[PDB]
Enzyme design. Sequence first.
Site, PDB file in Angstrom:
ATOM      1  N   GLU A 108       0.885  -1.201   0.000  1.00  0.00           N
ATOM      2  CA  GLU A 108       0.000   0.000   0.000  1.00  0.00           C
ATOM      3  C   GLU A 108       0.896   1.216   0.000  1.00  0.00           C
ATOM      4  OE1 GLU A 108      -2.107   0.665   3.738  1.00  0.00           O
ATOM      5  OE2 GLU A 108      -3.826   1.468   2.646  1.00  0.00           O
ATOM      6  N   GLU A 124      -8.001  11.124   3.116  1.00  0.00           N
ATOM      7  CA  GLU A 124      -8.230  10.222   4.250  1.00  0.00           C
ATOM      8  C   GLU A 124      -8.347  11.054   5.522  1.00  0.00           C
ATOM      9  OE1 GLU A 124      -5.569   6.958   4.568  1.00  0.00           O
ATOM     10  OE2 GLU A 124      -6.527   6.092   6.355  1.00  0.00           O
TER      11      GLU A 124
END
Length: 276
Positions: A139, A241
């Site tokens: 990621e 985010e």
Amino acid sequence: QVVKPTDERIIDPSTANTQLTGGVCYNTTSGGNKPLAGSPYGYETWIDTGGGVCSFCWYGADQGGGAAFKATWTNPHDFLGRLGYFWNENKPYSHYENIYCGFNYTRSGRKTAGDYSYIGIYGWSRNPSASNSNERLIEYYIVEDWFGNQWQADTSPMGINTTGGTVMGSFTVDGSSYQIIKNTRVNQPSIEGDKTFVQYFSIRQSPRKSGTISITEHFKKWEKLGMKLGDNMYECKFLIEAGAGEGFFDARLIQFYRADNEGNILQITPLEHHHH
């Protein structure tokens, strides 16, 4: 010898500051990538129903660079909204060549996204032939900005107290040093289910709300530090985010393009040049 694209379709991020209207909004988890009509891009939303309400709105194919979005959140539990290139075609990052994202947005101020938050480029990649089983899934984040928190200004770059893991090195691109971090996620949720995987971070030392991101330069420098991405890049998308808090994010520009070493455009939105 990589030449910066100068193609006329590229929107100068520094003056792309006109508010956009007519978003199409999604308020629930999308369940992975969802393609958008009339667009090369796909979106994903992770809106955790155990926490607060969020909204994620795409400004459409014909303005703001084609990938602009707005998001709002009201005490979420780790809201992620993202939009951009979706791949997972079994091709390495190098197949997509020199990747750029031009951006300009407003957002809510310091301490409006909880204790951790991220703004920038995000994705995954798979490297099944890695000797280290922990490194077969990646990621990744390229972090341009964040909302700080109670203890740190939003003008101060995040460190490993937020990201976890280890500082591997640094480099300078797009007007700022970036700190390069590697972290191991031990039996955590992922695109392959619960397992051990690695995260790669580039943290922009001078946070900013507009500019151009030379994404491939990050992939290259990670690779020179032994942070390999492998042969199947999952995606490459612009991310908001928010860990928690009550805030917003509103892009006037998100423009992805790709080009060769000479600077010539391979892909861009909008597709056509600007009749008077």
